[PDB]
Every structure is written in structure tokens, then in C-alpha cells.
């Protein structure tokens, strides 16, 4: 029943006249109701009540306007990149990872923001300032302290709005919102509110605004003081994948320090929540702002891998949900490209191709890894990285990054009640154990003490090495010549807390030989080989098919090696004097033939304990093991022990 | 020339002519005179005043939510209304008589 309206503005003495036709305008614009916004505007509101509703909102002080520069994340199209529409994914574009490809931005953005809802509610904290907006959105929602502190971050492709809401025990509730985006793209304000009076940070084009009442602002300022300047700086100047990785490391530090078991209401935690929201928004808005073009598939994979990791981590910890930023077309494309490479021979490709393949494996198969064959891929990425890596040395940055990207599907599969990739997961864990030495642990502890990228991931997190108590760790810790000693202590604490069995219930609850042992707390190492699997513990009750005992000093805990034949336990230990480990002094150093492939090597010390574990795989590993500086026969406390596939334990002590 | 706003009720359907003042007319008050259709002599035109800032914000929101299907006329309306919104300050209105033009 709406018609037209004439607006008249007598400004600067001159009268201008405009005409608004609500008919046809409403016909060509769906979901637009003029009378709804007319009621929501409170047109008849007197000046007194309008001023009262104005002063009920925390107005910030005028900031200076920090000059920043956004980065260059999304590149230009690369030559003959076949543009793919996300709505129609044909299985004929699977010309391997070598063929350049990009995905069209409009259907991709429509798939990411497929869901639509209201994001400016009719609640009291937001009704005063914002016109009720209903649009296509994606949200990240979490609630901690038993639904007593909730954070909901909704986002379009133009702006993100996060909202904290804490319900006190008395019954009252305090709400505070942070809106980040482009100043021209921020939502429409209601009443006499402008944006300069609410802006907390502002660059050249971007803006970060806070919306709350003075009372709620004080109640939040009590326990929440965020560095909005550096927050906005990191949100604007960083790229998508880099910001996602930064938020990932922050969430890892939160999971170590106290953990998500008891989430703290510290500024760091709420900052990390809003930064998760910003990390998702930085991919959504970046895809939506390129202007109907297409985004490279490499960039898409590199960003959505980090996004899926963040989603999995916030769902594991805070039980948070992420509705949106999915794109089923991207999932189909990644799963299609996955069938173009052999997972068993994935490690023979270039490191860039390996990272590409692992990105696509995480993107196209995010559903808890129902297709478990991806594990055999990651194993192939690790095994190939094992034979070409200098033994007993810290992992290089490139290798650490590659293995961190590859280990996500292994982490996913390790949290399953059952898994068909038993031996593959066992081989992955055995290689992870053999990679964890003293120098690797030292590098991890250094990175954790400073906070660099080295402490983000290492194979020792997935290792079958249980002997790492406190004393052993801060003995393996680096000599803090230019480090904070308390930081090294905290790094050791976090390193040992992540390795806990109570941590998310991973480890090896489905390992077949894991059920042979009884006193599981006295286990020091598990080695899963092809036929038999060895257990190194300090208890003679291992329940295996044999029982060995290596040379060790008095007082110090004994070293009991017990094999398990074909992953099948026996009745109960051996009920006899433990076997003597046969010595080998009739051995030659030069071995041109690959006669040790498939065994295991343990260098241990009688007084301290185990030092090095090595899965002796290809001819390169056997070579680097044999004739090198590794074999020292100086200290009478260090011994070298060999474990075969036939279940026979030996001790090597002669070389000529 | 000026007006006063109190909160008889006329819907947006019976609105035909709205009149928005400037930052110098009625002090710094953003006021809007809403007048019914003029068609007929049996039918009198009723004029009720309202908060000009709220009307300008409502129309800015409507025009922004329909920017895809907007003529240059309505685009000029949007620009001039945005500069009109920025011409009134909600501050420097605290100690002023919020009922400056109520004659009782």
C-alpha cells in the first residue's frame, strides 16, 4: 500500500527536491521493507528520549588515525588457469597439481555465505545503535564457563561483528560488540549515532568500532582490556594465511597454558576469540572483495587449510561451531585432485607439491578422515622426509612446516574409536619417535621459550616416547645463555603437558600391543615394527613372547625390552630370569649390502636412560648410521642395541 | 517556520511530503515535517513533526540497502542526506532546551 514520497531539503538557502518511489523499488529489491525500518527508526522519538538513548552508549575518544598498508595476499591469475565455477565442478579439470587453476569468486562467495540470518538483533545493547540487518552471513559461536560467557562472531564479505556476552551469577548480563571492516562497508547506524564517536581504530580504509554501554564498558574493562591498536594493526597488515597461523599459535599457547579444560576470562583469551573471528573474516572478505574475478587454487588451499585447522581446534577445545566458510565446490575440487596422485608415493614430489597435496587433502576431506587412506599419504611425506634428513638433528624450517601441514590428518585419525590404517599410523608414530632426539627437543623448547615457529609443531608430539619426565626435559633443554630461565621452565612444562595421555585422548589407544602391558605408567618406549613390536619399560610385567634386559647401573631404573609376536600378546610375562642380550663383537663396519633395513637401533645410557631411537629404513639411513661419528665406544655407560623383525634383540659393540 | 516533537499516529502509507531543515535553520536541530497527501479539498493535509536525524538515517539506510537498483537522482539524494546528517551534531545539544519550540 506504499506509493511515493517527496523529500525537500532547504540547505544553504537553496531548496532541492527529490522523489522516492517505494513501489518498483521494493519490487526490484528483495527482502526490503520500508515500514519495518520506519518502525525501527522511532521517528516520533522526542529529543529528550533520543538524547537519553544516545548517552546510554560508550562513546570513545577521538583517535589520531594510524597509517597502515594492507598486504597483497590474492595474486593475479597465472597464465592459462582454467577458471572453475564452484557450482558446476566437472571431473575433467583434474590435470594434476601442475596445471594452474582458479575458482570464480562470485559462486565461491555465494557458497561460503550460503546461509542467511539476522546479525543486528533487536536486543537492548544493539537496538540503540543499529538498524536490524538480515543478510547472508557466516558465524563462529562458542560458550564457556557453562553457558556463562558466550562469544558469537558473525561476518559477511564486507564486515565482521563479534559479540561477547557474560551473564553474572546475580542474573544480569553484559554485552559488548566489536565491528571490524571497511568504513564505507560498515552497517547502517540508527538515531543520532555517527561512527567517529565510536571508532576505536582506523587506518586509511579500514575501521574497528566498539559498541556497548558505559556500564557494560566498565564491567568489561574490569577484566578485559584489549590492545585494539595492535589488534587492528595485525588484522589489517597481515595476510590471510599468516594471520590464521598467528591465531593458531595463540590458540596452541592457550591450550598449553591452563588449556581449554578451564578457560580463563583473561584479555588474551577474548583477544584470541575475536582473532579467530577476524581470521575467518580475512578469508571471506578477501574472496568477496576481488570483484567477481577468480582466486587462485593454491591460495585457496593454503588459506582454507589453516581455516579448517582453526575450526577443528576450536571445536576440540571450546566446542565452538563454525557455520559457513565451507564451499562444497572447493571440497569436491580438492577431493578430485586428490585422486590424481599416489598417496603411497606422495613423498617423491617437490616440497611445494607436497604442501599443495596436503593442503588439498585437509580441505577436501575434513570430515574426521572417513577416507583413512590420506594417512598413507602423510606417512609417505614423513618417510621420504626421514631418509633425506640428517639423523639426530633438529628439523629444518621447511621440513617442520611440511610435516606440520601433513600431520593434521594423522591428528584427526588418532582421535577415532577405530581406524583401518593401523600399520600406517604405527609407522608414522615410529618415524616420529625416531626423529625425536635431544637436539630436536632442545630446539622445540627454545622455540616454546621464545614463542617462534619452531615450537609450533614437532614429531615428538606424536612420538611413542613416554620417558620424557621433567628432569630429562630440562636436562635436554638448551643452555639459556641469552634466554629467560623461567621461560625455559614454562616451555618444558608446556612440552610435557601437551604430551599428556589426558590431552584429548590420542596417543595410541588402538595400538594392538598397547593392551599387552599392565602397568602402563612404567612404559618408556613403544616400537611398532612389521611383524613384532617391542616395548621398553621399567617393569618385568610386559606380557610378551620374550623378555630381555639390557646392561644398566645399580639404583637406576632397569631397562626391560619385551617383544610382542605379530601384535598378539601372551599369557603373562615370561616367569623366569630375563634373557641376556647377545653381544656382537664379530661385526664389520663396511656393509655394502642393505642388510639392516627394517630393524631398529637404540642408543641408551645405563645411568640416565634412553638417548636415541632410530628406525633404520632405506640404505641411506643404514649408511649414515654405520660408518659415522654415531658409534662411540668410549663411555662404558652408553650402549647400542639392535631390534630385528624376528623378535631377536642384540647389542652391537664391535666394529672393524 | 520551526516545530516541536512529541509522541495522532499516521503510518508511512499516508506520508507524501517530508521537509528536512538545515544545520542553520532551527538552531542545530534536525527536524522533519511530515505532511499527508494534498489531493482533494474534502481532505485536509495533516503535518506532524519528527526527529530529523532519525528520518535522515532511515532514508540513508533504505537507499543504501537498495544501492544496486538506484538512479542518479536517488544517488544524489543519498550523498546530500549523508552530508546533511554530518551537518548536525548530537553533541553541543546537551545544555540546550530540547523543547525550544513548544509553546504550550
Amino acid at each position, epitope marked *: 500500500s506504499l506509493s511515493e514520497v517527496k523529500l525537500h531539503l532547504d*540547505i*544553504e*538557502g*537553496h*531548496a532541492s*527536491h527529490y*522523489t522516492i518511489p517505494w513501489t518498483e523499488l521494493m519490487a526490484k529489491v528483495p527482502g526490503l521493507s520500508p515500514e519495518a525500518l520506519w518502525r525501527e527508526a522511532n521517528v516520533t522519538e522526542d529529543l529528550a528520549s533520543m538524547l537519553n538513548r544516545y548517552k546510554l552508549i560508550y562513546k570513545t575518544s577521538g583517535t589520531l588515525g594510524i597509517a597502515l598498508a594492507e598486504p597483497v595476499d590474492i595474486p593475479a591469475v597465472s597464465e592459462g588457469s582454467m577458471q572453475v565455477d564452484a557450482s558446476k565442478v566437472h571431473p575433467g579439470v583434474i590435470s594434476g597439481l601442475n596445471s594452474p587453476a582458479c575458482m570464480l569468486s562470485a559462486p565461491l562467495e555465494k557458497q561460503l555465505f550460503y546461509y542467511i540470518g539476522t546479525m543486528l538483533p533487536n536486543t537492548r545493547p544493539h537496538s540503540y545503535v543499529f538498524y536490524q540487518l538480515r543478510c547472508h552471513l557466516s558465524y563462529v559461536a562458542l560458550s564457556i564457563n557453562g553457558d556463562k560467557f558466550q562469544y558469537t562472531g558473525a561476518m559477511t564479505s564486507k564486515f565482521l561483528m563479534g559479540t561477547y556476552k557474560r551473564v553474572t551469577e546475580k542474573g544480569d548480563e553484559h554485552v559488548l560488540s566489536l565491528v571490524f571492516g571497511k568504513t564505507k562497508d560498515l552497517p547502517d547506524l540508527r538515531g543520532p549515532f555517527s561512527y567517529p564517536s565510536l571508532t576505536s581504530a582506523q587506518s586509511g580504509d579500514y575501521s574497528l568500532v566498539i559498541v556497548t554501554t558505559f556500564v557494560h564498558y566498565a564491567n568489561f574493562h574490569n577484566y578485559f582490556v584489549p590492545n585494539l591498536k595492535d589488534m587492528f594493526s595485525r588484522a589489517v597488515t597481515m595476510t590471510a594465511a599468516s594471520y590464521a597461523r598467528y591465531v593458531l599459535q595463540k590458540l596452541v599457547l592457550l591450550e598449553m597454558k591452563g588449556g581449554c579444560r578451564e578457560p580463563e576470562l583473561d584479555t588474551e583469551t577474548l583477544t584470541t576469540m575475536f582473532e579467530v573471528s577476524v581470521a575467518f573474516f580475512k578469508v571471506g572478505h578477501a574472496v568477496g572483495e576481488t570483484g567477481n574475478g577468480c582466486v587462485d587454487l593454491r591460495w585457496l588451499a593454503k588459506s582454507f587449510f589453516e581455516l579448517t585447522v582453526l575450526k577443528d581446534i576450536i571445536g576440540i577445545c571450546y566446542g565452538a561451531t563454525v557455520k559457513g566458510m565451507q564451499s562444497y565446490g572447493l571440497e569436491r575440487l580438492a577431493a578430485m585432485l586428490m585422486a590424481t596422485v599416489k598417496m603411497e608415493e606422495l613423498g617423491h614430489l617437490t616440497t611445494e607439491k607436497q604442501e599443495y597435496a596436503l593442503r588439498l587433502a585437509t580441505v577436501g576431506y575434513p570430515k574426521a578422515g572417513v577416507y583413512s587412506g590420506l594417512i598413507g599419504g602423510a606417512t609417505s611425506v614423513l618417510l621420504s622426509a626421514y631418509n633425506r634428513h640428517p639423523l639426530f638433528q633438529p628439523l629444518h624450517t621447511v621440513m617442520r612446516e611440511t610435516l606440520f601441514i601433513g600431520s593434521h590428518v594423522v591428528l584427526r585419525e588418532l582421535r577415532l574409536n577405530v581406524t583401518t590404517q593401523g600399520p600406517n599410523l604405527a609407522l608414522y608414530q615410529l618415524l616420529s619417535t625416531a626423529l625425536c632426539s635431544a637436539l630436536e627437543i632442545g630446539e622445540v623448547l627454545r622455540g616454546l621459550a621464545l614463542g617462534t615457529e619452531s615450537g609450533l609443531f614437532s614429531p615428538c608430539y606424536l612420538s611413542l616416547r613416554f620417558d620424557l619426565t621433567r628432569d630429562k626435559l630440562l636436562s635436554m633443554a638448551p643452555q639459556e645463555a641469552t634466554l629467560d630461565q623461567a621461560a625455559v621452565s614454562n616451555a618444558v612444562d608446556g612440552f610435557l603437558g601437551r604430551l599428556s595421555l589426558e590431552r584429548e585422548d590420542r596417543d595410541a589407544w588402538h595400538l594392538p600391543a598397547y593392551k599387552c602391558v599392565d602397568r602402563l605408567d612404567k612404559v618408556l618406549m613403544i616400537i611398532p615394527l612389521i611383524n613384532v613390536t617391542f616395548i621398553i619399560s621399567s617393569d618385568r610385567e610386559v606380557r610378551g613372547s620374550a623378555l630381555y634386559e639390557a646392561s644398566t647401573t645399580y639404583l637406576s631404573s632397569s631397562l626391560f625390552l619385551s617383544p610382542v609376536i605379530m601384535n598378539k600378546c601372551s599369557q603373562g610375562a615370561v616367569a623366569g630370569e630375563p634373557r641376556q642380550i647377545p653381544k656382537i663383537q664379530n661385526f664389520t663396519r663396511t656393509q655394502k649390502s642393505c642388510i639392516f633395513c627394517g630393524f631398529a637401533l637404540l642408543s641408551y645410557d645405563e645411568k640416565e636412560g634412553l638417548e636415541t631411537t632410530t628406525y633404520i629404513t632405506s640404505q641411506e639411513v643404514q649408511n649414515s648410521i654405520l660408518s659415522s661419528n654415531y658409534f662411540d665406544f668410549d663411555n662404558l655407560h652408553v650402549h647400542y642395541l639392535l631390534l630385528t623383525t624376528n623378535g631377536t634383540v642384540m647389542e652391537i659393540a664391535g666394529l672393524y | 517556520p520551526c516545530c516541536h516533537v512529541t509522541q495522532h499516529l499516521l503510518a508511512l502509507e499516508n506520508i507524501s511530503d517530508i521537509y528536512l531543515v538545515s544545520n542553520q*535553520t532551527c538552531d542545530g536541530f534536525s527536524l522533519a515535517s511530515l505532511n499527508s497527501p494534498k489531493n482533494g479539498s474534502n481532505q485536509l493535509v495533516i503535518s506532524r513533526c519528527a526527529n530529523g536525524l532519525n528520518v535522515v538515517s532511515f532514508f540513508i539506510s533504505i537507499l543504501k540497502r537498495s544501492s544496486s537498483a538506484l538512479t542518479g*537522482h536517488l544517488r544524489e539524494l543519498l550523498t546530500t542526506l549523508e552530508t546533511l546528517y554530518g551537518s548536525f551534531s548530537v553533541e553541543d545539544l546537551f545544555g540546550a532546551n530540547l523543547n525550544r519550540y513548544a509553546w504550550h
Partner: antibody
Amino acid sequence: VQLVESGGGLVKPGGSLRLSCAASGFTFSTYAMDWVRQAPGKGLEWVSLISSRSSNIYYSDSVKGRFTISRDNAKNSLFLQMNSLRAEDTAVYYCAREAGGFHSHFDMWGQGTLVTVSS
Amino acid sequence: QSVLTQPASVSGSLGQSVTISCTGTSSDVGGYDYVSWYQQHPGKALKLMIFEVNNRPSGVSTRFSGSKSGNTASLTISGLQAEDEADYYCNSYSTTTTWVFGGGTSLTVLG
């Protein structure tokens, strides 16, 4: 409320000419002032419009980047500068006052000045 | 450009009435809003006779009246006196060209 133009005369084609326009008897900073010309023995056409304190100005497509408006403070005078004149600019120029609030028409006019653009 | 059209020849016998019109497009904004009519006289500086379609200023007589715009508008002069025959122009607000002005009508009294 007298309103006087002055400042017009004979000029060469492609030259320059500065028309003045003195007004009195009313608050000159409250109303917008327009320049409207009339060819000799022909109809009337709007030239330009200046607002109070020279905020936003309007030019017809027939002048574009050739004529410029100017104003001063209080009851001072209005001005129009003409650069690169052509034969079609031969007309009598009036400076009229626009009406008050929510009005689109002219109030008082001036006597006008004859501007003849001929070689 | 975009000037509005009005007839040049207009005549009316003494003592009666005569109607002038100036058609337009979006300048007459459909519903009647803001149209003016001025008289010119020989060598004079114009005087507003009608404004806002059909509104008269103080000092003018009720002989002049305005008609519904619709899309053409009209000015009716009743009781044509001696000072009535002259040049008459119409003016309107144009959303495209700010002001749209008349071409001119030379009204002459025949009686």
C-alpha cells in the same frame, strides 16, 4: 531591497569580463543568489547559482568551465567572472534572489547588464 | 539544454480571461509542485506573478491564478487590464538542470 548589477559592457570574443552585483535592504547571507541571462529579444535561460557562504555552486551545461561565481560577507556584492566568451553569451544578465525555506522560485531581480560579445 | 515548450502566440479579449501553458517532463514532477510564472514588460526586470503552481505573493492581484500541473501546468489571467499584455515566462525546478525556464509568450489584448 534594491538590487543592482553594474559592471557590464562591450567585450571582444574569447575575452574576459567581470560582472558585479550589489544588493542591499536584506540579509544577503541568508538567501541563495542566481545569475540568469536573457538574449536580446529572446527567452530567458538560467546561468548559475551560488548558495549562502558559497558552499555548493551550480552551473548550467552552457557555461561549464567558463563562468565562475563569487560572493562576499554580510550585505556585500555578488560577482560573476566570464572567461573565454563566445557570441552566444550576448545577453542582459540579471542577478536574482532565490526564495526562502522549501521554495523553488525567484524573489527579487535586478535591472541587469548588457554583455555584448562581438568582434 | 532541455528547455520546456510553451506556445508563443497568446491572445485574449478585454475583460474576460486567457490561459497560458508550458508543458514539461520530470520538471512538473507529476503532482503539482513548485512552478512559477513571471511577467516581463518592455525592458523591465520581471516580477513574480505566480509561484508554487497556484500561490500569489503580497501586492499582486487575484486576476492571475495557477492550474493543476499534471504535466503541462497553466496560468489563467482573468479580467485582462491594460498593463497585462506583455511577455510571460514560466519556470520550474528540474532534477537534471537545476532550473528550467520558459521560452516566452507574448500576450496581447484584442479588445
